[PDB]
């Protein structure tokens, strides 16, 4: 009932860190994103992933990074992880030059397309907006199998990031992983990340329309076993 972790490598971890965008996109500089990346770099490295951080990629670069990565030989690896830090809209992330469908970035790893990652977990963590809604708060193996998307927010909603500390989702995810990454199952970790973000964060803003908002992450799992980074 657990994913076999007996491989010489845990797996590759691609971190796409998009901070500066083309003015044609009209997207602002994501302050605090470098802090997220560095933190995420330390966590996933600790977990034992071979992480490489790619900055200000463009949609093609991103698609290539993923197409190529899916093309490597993952036979000696337990899994694959990819973390996306950037701007976004519903179903789409922003390259420095525009927006590309997350579905395209992930499909490369389908069972029919990455045989060496077949029956192995493929993890994508996405920190990006998914719309413009604010939460006010209240006081034969299937080809689509073995994927897990840890989104920072829910469909149709904004995702918060503090210029000086990083995004809520990443601050949360990193504290949890640092302390429990090696002892709790992935769903437990993400559930705790879910609770941490919901209870410990609340937007501070000068625009009242954007003041005191809350946020809840969203985990989608097509996993078929329990995942322990150990």
């Amino acid at each position: 009932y657990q994913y076999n972790m007996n491989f010489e490598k845990l797996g590759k971890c691609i971190i796409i860190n998009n901070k500066n965008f083309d003015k044609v996109t009209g997207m602002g500089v994501r302050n605090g994103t470098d802090k997220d990346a560095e933190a995420l770099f330390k966590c996933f490295r600790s977990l034992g992933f071979d992480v490489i951080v790619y900055n200000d990629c463009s949609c093609a670069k991103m698609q290539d990074l993923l197409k190529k990565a899916s093309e490597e030989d993952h036979t000696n690896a337990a899994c694959f992880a990819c973390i996306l830090l950037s701007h976004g809209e519903e179903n789409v992330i922003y390259g420095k030059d525009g927006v590309t469908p997350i579905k395209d970035l992930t499909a490369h790893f389908r069972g029919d397309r990455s045989k060496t990652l077949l029956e192995k977990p493929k993890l994508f963590f996405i920190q990006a907006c998914r719309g413009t809604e604010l939460d006010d708060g209240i006081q034969k193996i299937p080809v689509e199998a073995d994927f897990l998307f840890a989104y920072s927010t829910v469909p149709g909603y904004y995702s918060w990031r503090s210029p000086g500390r990083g995004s809520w989702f990443v601050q949360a995810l990193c504290s949890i992983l640092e302390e429990h990454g090696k002892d709790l199952e992935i769903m437990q970790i993400l559930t705790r990340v879910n609770d941490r973000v919901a209870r410990h964060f609340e937007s501070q803003s000068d625009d009242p329309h954007f003041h005191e908002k809350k946020q809840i992450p969203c985990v989608v799992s097509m996993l078929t076993k329990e995942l322990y980074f150990s």
Binding site: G28, R30, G32, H87, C129, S159, W160, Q204, S205, F210
Partner: peptide
């Protein structure tokens, strides 16, 4: 706070 900023949003993404």
């Amino acid at each position: 706070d900023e949003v993404x």
